[PDB]
Design a protein around this ligand. Structure first.
Ligand SMILES: *CCC(=O)N1CCN(c2nc(O[C@H](C)CN(C)C)nc3c2CCN(c2cc(O)cc4ccccc24)C3)CC1
Ligand SMILES: Nc1nc2c(ncn2[C@@H]2O[C@H](COP(=O)(O)OP(=O)(O)O)[C@@H](O)[C@H]2O)c(=O)[nH]1
Ligand SMILES: [Mg+2]
Length: 169
């Protein structure tokens, strides 16, 4: 069975755990322990292909042991998650671009930019700024809400399609 290793990165509180549990269980979590980093499995059909998604929900401490590098390096594609109400989380995306390029030793790593919490009225990051950033990176941008499930399937399935594009090269 085809398997895709996805890694969900981004600042505390952007909704990485909530997006992951939405994808898997179709339920929105109000509280998800921010100390729990682990990989989940979900069988999906995308464009007619049955596959297993292995989803690393990143969490815990920001630390850079060789073991942590190796966990992140297993990723075939990365969801770059910020929250539309958190400017700092948006400013953190550049850091994640640098660390993914470092561990994958590549300027061609499958990635999707995800603007989460699209349901909140307290926007501080304009859609235009996120679209411009994703364009500059050559990657898709998806607006999501883990609360309403807006965009959740599209974010993960688009990442799988980016990995397929890479595998073709
Ligand atoms: C609230 C808990 C949580 O979800 N997480 C804690 C913060 N974590 C990371 N944060 C950052 O940078 C933050 C957003 C901004 N800082 C203050 C500059 N960077 C990382 C993590 C987890 C570890 N990440 C990491 C580590 C190694 O060794 C290698 C690679 C390679 C590619 C991507 C990340 C990465 C960096 C996690 C979330
Ligand atoms: N309103 C709203 N709240 C969300 C959304 N995604 C996550 N949250 C909430 O934001 C908080 C942080 O979510 P979590 O998934 O723990 O973020 P993580 O630290 O990135 O794993 C939790 O209270 C969630 O219920 C979203 O799209 N909309
Ligand atoms: Mg979490």
């Amino acid at each position: 069975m085809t398997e895709y290793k996805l890694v969900v990165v981004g600042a505390c509180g952007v909704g990485k755990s909530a997006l992951t549990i939405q994808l898997i269980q179709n339920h929105f979590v109000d509280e998800y322990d921010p100390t729990i980093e682990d990989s989940y499995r979900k069988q999906v059909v995308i464009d007619g292909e049955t596959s297993l998604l292995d989803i690393l929900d990143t969490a815990g401490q920001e630390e850079y042991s060789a073991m942590r590098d190796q966990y992140m390096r297993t990723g075939e594609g990365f969801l770059l998650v910020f929250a539309i109400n958190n400017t700092k989380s948006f400013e953190d995306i550049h850091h994640y671009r640098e660390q993914i390029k470092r561990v994958k030793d590549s300027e061609d790593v499958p990635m999707v930019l995800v603007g989460n919490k699209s349901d909140l009225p307290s926007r501080t990051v304009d859609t235009k700024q996120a679209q411009d950033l994703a364009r500059s990176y050559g990657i898709p941008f998806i607006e999501t809400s883990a609360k309403t499930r807006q965009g959740v399937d599209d974010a993960f399935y688009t990442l799988v399609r980016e990995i397929r594009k890479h595998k073709e090269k």
